[PDB]
Amino acid sequence: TVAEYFRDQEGQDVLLFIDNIFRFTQAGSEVSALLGRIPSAVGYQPTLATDMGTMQERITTTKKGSITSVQAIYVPADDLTDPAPATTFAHLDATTVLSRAIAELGIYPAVDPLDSTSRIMDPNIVGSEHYDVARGVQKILQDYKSLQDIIAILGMDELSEEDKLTVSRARKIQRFLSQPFQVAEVFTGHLGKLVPLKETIKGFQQILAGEYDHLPEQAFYMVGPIEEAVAKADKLAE
């Protein structure tokens, strides 16, 4: 309701954090019982769907603004088969799985990259530049991942260094996803840097293209803009 104000009234893209829908659904469901309502399979409130639905349907892009809904999602039963998330998926179109591990690699930000996904990535909407580059990347990351598996166990020149190169490119790309931080600048030092899309698409593409590969990788580490990566690249090449 508030967000409807900001959307419509304030014409905005309201960001709606709903944290967590799991708790929501659950909250409804808690009542379901008491309400003598028949809940559902898996216990869910019967209304699980409507509950979600109308609500999701109440979120959108009006032609005033958007209520862009970013929903923090505690995962019920850590599956999605738990009907709601599956349903949620119906309403999910950009999906965030954060990689605790990547973060643990000191990478900041450090999502699960391949499961930083969107059904809405397109060579159309987001165009092929994005798409493809990404497809190349996503793939690449994986490819790098693939090689990781080999090398990991077998020490090295277990690769040919084009694989290494891609591995490296990927690393840079990887690192470029790391971005210095503003909010936790108090901790980190540096600042939250913001990356206009073209620099992004371009950015990785370049790294991918190896056009930058003759430079180090921490360059990309803690960078927003591909320039800020390039600049740091140079800088790491002292």
């Binding site: 469901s29 808690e30 009542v31 379901s32 019982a33 008491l34 003598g36 809940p39 216990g43």
Partner: peptide, 13 residues
């Protein structure tokens, strides 16, 4: 009165 989910109360939570 109902219990709830997993056969046990809801708002026991």
């Amino acid at each position: 009165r109902p219990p709830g989910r997993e056969a046990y109360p809801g708002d026991v939570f």
